[PDB]
């Protein structure tokens, strides 16, 4: 499975969803997650993220390990997203800010 980590939060560019062959991204207010059962690990999304927030599960940084289980849990509750849309309004002010998990909205 590929995992969306911290830098997506409050950026949510959604470029990633274009390339997904199996449509396994699920949408929240200011973050996207990948559904781990559905992902086929084709890796096509992680060059597409502007925020470089997508990682192969086995490459998630040590200090972002929480995101693996978070993607798994929120994918079960959030709606599927299959079309790219506009980035959040202030997405590049937040692109690169560390510690954005405290801003996640359910
Ligand atoms: S690795 Fe492939 S299947 Fe998994 S979320 Fe990315 S594009 Fe979709
Ligand atoms: S910012 Fe998030 S919405 Fe997709 S393009 Fe990157 S994982």
């Amino acid at each position: 499975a590929f995992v969306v980590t911290d830098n997506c939060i409050k950026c949510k560019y959604t470029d990633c969803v274009e390339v997904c062959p199996v449509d396994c991204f699920y949408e929240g207010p200011n973050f996207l997650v990948i559904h781990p059962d559905e992902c086929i690990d084709c890796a096509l999304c992680e060059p597409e993220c502007p925020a470089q927030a997508i990682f192969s599960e086995d490459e998630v940084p040590e200090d972002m390990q929480e995101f693996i289980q978070l993607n798994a849990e929120l994918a079960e509750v959030w709606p599927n997203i299959t079309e790219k849309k506009d980035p959040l309004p202030d997405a590049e002010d937040w692109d690169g800010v560390k510690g954005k998990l405290q801003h996640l909205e359910r």
Side-chain angles (χ1 to χ4, degrees), residues 57-105:
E57 176 191 9
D58 50 63
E59 292 177 37
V60 174
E62 193 281 318
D63 69 333
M64 286 197 272
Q65 287 288 306
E66 338 60 284
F67 284 93
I68 301 171
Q69 194 180 309
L70 236 209
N71 275 241
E73 298 281 348
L74 295 172
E76 296 299 305
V77 295
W78 280 348
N80 197 200
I81 176 185
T82 59
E83 300 202 61
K84 197 204 137 63
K85 75 224 293 171
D86 278 287
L88 290 179
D90 277 39
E92 37 58 274
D93 293 338
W94 287 102
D95 188 326
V97 171
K98 83 143 197 269
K100 286 189 296 176
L101 185 61
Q102 63 173 301
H103 300 104
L104 189 111
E105 296 168 64

Side-chain angles (χ1 to χ4, degrees), residues 3-5 7-9 11-17 25 31-32 34 45 48-54 81:
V3 178
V4 177
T5 63
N7 201 31
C8 181
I9 302 172
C11 289
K12 185 186 171 182
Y13 290 100
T14 71
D15 292 302
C16 57
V17 306
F25 282 92
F31 182 56
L32 259 58
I34 289 166
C45 52
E48 298 304 295
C49 179
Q52 283 305 290
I54 293 186
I81 176 185

